[PDB]
Amino acid sequence: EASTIGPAFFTPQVLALEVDCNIECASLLDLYGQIEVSRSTF
Amino acid sequence: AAPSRLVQPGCFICRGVAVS
Amino acid sequence: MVKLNCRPLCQAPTASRLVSPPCFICRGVAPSAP
Amino acid sequence: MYFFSVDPRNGASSCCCESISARPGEVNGVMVSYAAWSAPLRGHGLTNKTTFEIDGVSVTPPKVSNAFGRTKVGVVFEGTLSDLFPNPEGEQVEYEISELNGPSNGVVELGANGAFTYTPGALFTGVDRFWFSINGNIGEYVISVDPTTSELPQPPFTTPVYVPAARRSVDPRTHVLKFVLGVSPAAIPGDVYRLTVRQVAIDCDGNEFVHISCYDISIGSCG
Amino acid sequence: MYFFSVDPRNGASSCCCESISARPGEVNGVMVSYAAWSAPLRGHGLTNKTTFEIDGVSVTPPKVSNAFGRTKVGVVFEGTLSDLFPNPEGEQVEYEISELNGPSNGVVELGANGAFTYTPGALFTGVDRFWFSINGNIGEYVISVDPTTSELPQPPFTTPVYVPAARRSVDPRTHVLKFVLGVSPAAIPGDVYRLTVRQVAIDCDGNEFVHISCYDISIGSCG
Amino acid sequence: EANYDFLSFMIGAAQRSHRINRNQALMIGKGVNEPKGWLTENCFPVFQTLPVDVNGTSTPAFLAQDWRRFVTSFPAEYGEARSVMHQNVFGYLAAMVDANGRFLFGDGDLTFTPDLVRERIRISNCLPDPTEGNTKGGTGQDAFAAGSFVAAQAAWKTAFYAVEKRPMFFEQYEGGSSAWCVKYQFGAEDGGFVGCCEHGRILQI
Amino acid sequence: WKTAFYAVEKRPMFFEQYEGGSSAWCVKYQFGAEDGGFVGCCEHGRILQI
Amino acid sequence: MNFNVGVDFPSFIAWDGEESFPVKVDGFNQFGFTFKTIAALTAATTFNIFYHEPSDADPCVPGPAIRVPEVPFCDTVLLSEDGLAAVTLPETVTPDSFCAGTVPCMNGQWISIAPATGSETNAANVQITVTMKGATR
Amino acid sequence: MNFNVGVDFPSFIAWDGEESFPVKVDGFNQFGFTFKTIAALTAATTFNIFYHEPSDADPCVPGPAIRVPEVPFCDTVLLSEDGLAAVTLPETVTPDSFCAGTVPCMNGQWISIAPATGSETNAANVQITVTMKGATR
Incomplete structure (x- = not known):
């Protein structure tokens, strides 16, 4: 019978969502002046 | 620079x- | 080498005030007087 | 940072124990290189089963006594300093609180006649000590700040010379034991203590090779 | 690590036996190079059939006696430490539990007057030792915690100088014998023991070539 | 095993951790081992508002008249400049009120939501906000923490430079990795400095 | 709300006459449905209280 | 509609706060602990982990208690100074929150927990149970 | 290779032989008991099942002890007299053998087991415990 036989005969429906809830912040790296460089100590 | 007021x-x- | 893992059974609420400029x-x- | 290369127990190359000069207040570091003894014993190097013991061969018992108090968080604590200097002869008591060895998470103000007030820093609970100096003689006054709930236990009245609880280490790749040697600010110059070390190596199958040495710590002022 | 090259019995090349210094508490290792004696006897090299024997040529019998007790697992054990030191004169007794030789699976609360309580570690079954010291006289006290069913045997009260049961090895490829030589913490400085080693070789067919040598262990303090 | 792909999670949770650490550094990074950020170097000219006497107590304050005088003062000879600030501050400006009770912005809309890119404000809510998160600042009394930071403004394309030498990279660390356990190693190399710091400005309390 | 609270749909209602128990003098119907929901992640929502 | 989750992951008491218990783990292949406190702790408490072996007198009763060695993975740097596995419930664990953990390699047939010395008067306020996984036979 | 299965099927104590312990079953959505005997019983042993409610004052402490009702499933002919759930550990159940039962319909948020009256003599030799199944936080 059912509801008294282990918990392995019933396979749950694995739905396809993934809750995240994580703010990075806000980007501030495109205002600054960008300069590619070479070997350090320019 | 020193903090200047505004x-x-x-x-x-x-x-x-x-005014009275 | 045990590495523990802990959760709380009952999360608590979190209140806060909402002060706004006067x-x-x-x-x-x-035009004034001393 | 002292460095001793221990005897190799090979039947080959004044007092017995090596010497260590220490000044009251410092907290130094010591290295010991068991390489000459444990390298031929091809095993798994050393193990962290070393033990230390500190015995005194000259003490000159202290003049002033220590004292222990109790208080909760935020509540001001008051205490005296006159019942701690048993003077066999009559003399004045030039109370002084050393600015170097003051409290850590609070503040004290010295009274004019054996008075002081320890107002702990706000939102702080734990144990806080500070070292007074009655007429050149030095002691300690230890107070515990309780989180107002029940009570706190008793701290152990730090000794003149100690080896800290868990700061030892060992590198089995080079057979070196490192530990810390700390001296209380109340250790009296001229005294001599003796430190003993039992270090245990290990063979391939888990047995033990023991080795004991000693060191003479002489508390001398000015290095 | 000691090393002795043995004489090859060719009719060629103060006291008789070689010299071994030892320190109370140490556990060292010894190597012997039978190469010069067994290499000419071309056969199947050495065989692990070496036998040892320890004799005392200067003993200074122990002042304080040893003792033995028993307890079930988890149960605390308490006993006396005063009926073990018959003192000839009348004087005081300063009992002490050497920290370097405390117990290994419990703690001991040494009372003020020859009294102590031994709380065995949680879920522990075996034998456990700790070396007391009455007026400087050292003797061991053995406690065997039983696994609550019946009993464990009565261990043999380790001698002042011993060679362990089985930690020896013979390398037939380089004709070298190794063993461990441990010295009890109850050894008395100045005493001298004698270890005789009987090592057996073997021919290609299965006969024996015996060889006997001796060593003089001198128990010295400070190595 | 472990159906959830863990490696791609860490490669994702490393570029993310790097992204915010770099952004955090160029602002308040302190000298050694991290670029000298323009908040802590403090050679931008700094303006600070003067307090107001709420029934004779002189609490610190910051009102819209201060914001207009701060942004128009920028000498237009340096170029066009953008202002950065924490979003609570912009919430603070949007909720002001004149003496009779009306709103100073959007005189009745339930909301003031202006074109920000037509106002050069560039809200980035990681900066320090003087509202102590929220629930501080803008009081009659008992708030607003004199000496705090509010907002900045500069010709950023020349007031602060960002230096990049070698972007993020991942590689299997051959050595320390055996036939049963892998050891990965990632890294990147970059830095930053201030340009000429007479091109910026800062507002305080 | 599209990611703060979720609603789970499985099956709409049904209706059928319960045969056993419905005599030729009485009659008894029977119905039911099956659904549910949960709270996704309460860091995407606020509440304004007094 | 909850299942008889008892079979297919049963569980037993391993430390009721006053005395330990050996739990058999031969019949199953994977297992772990679930710590849980009943009252606020005073300092970090440490438990030792022990594995038994089938007694020679009877193969259905545990023998003496050996201590399980310690296995580092890669990230391990502490190594607990002893090479003998142990758990340590940190301070500030409010008594409405559980903590899980398990040894990376079983050995023997049984497993046991007991409070290490020093923290024997705080362990009277904790509870440790063991829940297994699929049954081999 | 064993998994740290304390998270994802934790287990807690419910009757250590001297005291019942409410176990919070809100955060999870399936649960069951795994009985276990420590020494031979004397007769049949009966246990009552209780469910609690969030207390009136504090919402994270259990309220009073309410006796959970029992429901049949198309084959109950025993049909316990007063329609209240109860479990009967049968006599002649040896040690090293565990029985696992579970109440069908869940209600409340804390569940508990207690030795039914007239059977608390040899109930000190049982040790019930609970294991939940799947967090729903």
């Missing part, structure tokens, strides 16, 4: 009637 |  104009209205 | 005052009014 004094702005106050509530300026009148030039001819002093 | 109706301003203006520093120094021209």
Whole structure:
């Protein structure tokens, strides 16, 4: 019978969502002046 | 640079009637 | 080498106030009295 | 940072124990290189089963006594300093609180006649000590700040010379034992203590090779 | 690590036996190089059939006696430490539990007057030792915690100088014998023991070539 | 095993951790081992508002008249400049009120939501906000923490430079990795400095 | 709300006459449905209280 | 509609706060602990982990208690100074929150927990149970 | 290779032989008991099942002890007298053997087991415990 036989005969429906809830912040790296460089100590 | 103040104009209205 | 893992059974709420700027005052009014 | 290369127990190359000069207040570091003894014993190097013991061969018992108090968080604590200097002869008591060895998470103000007040820093609970100096003689006054709930236990009245609880280490790749040697600010110059070390190596199968040495710590002022 | 090259019995090349210094508490290792004696006897090299024997040529019998007790697992054990030191004169007794030789699976709360309580570690079954010291006289006290069913045997009260049961090895490829030589913490400085080693070789067919040598262990303090 | 792909999670949770650490550094990074950020170097000219006497107590304050005088003062000879600030501050400006009770912005809309890119404000809510998160600042009394930071403004394309040498990279660390356990190693190399710091400005309390 | 609270749909209602128990003098119907929901992640929502 | 989750992951008491218990783990292949406190702790408590072996007198009763060695993975740097596995419930664990953990390699047939010395008067306020996984036979 | 299965099926104590312990079953959505005997019983042993409610004052402490009702499933002919759930550990159940039962319909948020009256003599030799199944936080 059912509801008294282990918990392995019933396979749950694995739905396809993934809750995240994580703010990075806000980007501030495109205002600054960008300069590619070479070997350090320019 | 030392912190400079930012004094702005106050509530300026009148030039001819002093308050009692 | 055990590495533990802990959760709380009952999370707690979290209240906070919502202070907002007061109706301003203006520093120094021209027509006035001492 | 002292460095001793221990005897190799090979039947080959004044007093017995090596010497260590220590000044009251310092907290130094010591290295010991068991390489000459444990390298031929091809095993798994050393193990962290070393033990230390500190015995005194000259003490000159202290003049002033210590004292222990109790208080909760935020509540000011008051205490005296006159019942701690048993003077066999009559003399004045130039109370002084050393600015170097003051409290850590609080503040004290010295009174004019054996008075002081320890107002702990806000939002702080734990144990806080500070070292007073009655007429050149030095002691300690230990107070515990309780989180107002029940009570706190008793701290162990730190000794003149100690080896800290868990700061030892060992590198089995080079057979070196490192430990810390700390001296209380109340250790009296001229005294001599003796430190003993039991270090245990290990063979391939888990047995033990023991080795004991000693060191003479002489508390001398000015290095 | 000691090393002795043995004489090859060729009719060629103060006291008789070689010299071994030892320190109370140490556990060292010894190597012997039978190469010069067994290499000419071309056969199957050495065989692990070496036998040892320890004799005392200067003993100074122990002042304080040893003792033995028993307890079940988890149960605390308490006993006396005063009926073990018959003192000839009348004087005081300063009992002490050497920290370097405390218990290994419990703690001991040494009371003020020859009294102590031994709390065995949680879920522990075996034998456990700790070396007391009455007026400087050292003797061991053995406690065997039983696994609550019946009993464990009565261990043999380790001698002042011993060679462990089985930690020896013979390298037939380089004709070298190794063993461990441990010295009890109850050894008395100045005493001298004698270890005789009987090592057996073997021919290609299965006969024996015996060889006997001796060593003089001198128990010295400070190595 | 472990159906959830863990490696791609860490490669994702490393570029993310790097992204915010770099952004955090160029602002308040302190000298050694991290670029000298322009908040802590403090050679931007700094303006600070003067307090107001709420029934004779002189609490610190910051009102809209201060914001207009701060942004128009920027000498237009340096170029066009953008202002950055924490979003609570912009919430603070939007909720002001004149003496009779009206709103100073959007005189009745339930909301003031202006075109920000037509106002050069560039909200980024990681900066320090003087509202102590929220629930501080803008009081009659008992708030607003004199000496705090509010907002900045500069010709950023020349007031602060960002230096990049070698972007993020990943590689299997051959050595320390055996036939049963892998050891990965990632890294990147970059830095930053201030340009000429007479091009910026800061507002305080 | 599209990611703060979720609603789970499985099956709409049904209706059928319960045969056993419905005599030729009485009659008894029977119905039911099956659904549910949960709270996704309460860091995407606020509440304004007094 | 909850299942008889008892079979297919049963569980037993391993430390009721006053005395330990050996739990058989031969019949199953994977297992772990679930710590849980009943009252606020005073300092970090440490438990030792022990594995038994089938007694020679009877193969259905545990023998003496050996201590399970310690296995580092890669990240391990502490190594607990002893090479003998042990758990340590940190301070500030409010008594409405559980903590899980398990040894990376079983050995023997039984497993046991007991409070290490020093923390024997705080362990009277904790509870440790063991829940297994699929049954081999 | 064993998994740290304390998370994802934790287990807690419910009757250590001297005291019942409410176990919070809200955060999870399936649970069951795994009985276990420590020494031979004397007769049949009966246990009552209780469910609690969130207390009136504090919402994270259990309220009073309410006796959970029992429901049949198309084959109950025993049909316990007063329609209240109860479990009867049968006599002649040896040690090293565990029985696992579970109440069908869940209610409340804390569940508990207590030795039914007239059977608390040899109930000190049982040790019930609970294991939940799947967090729903």
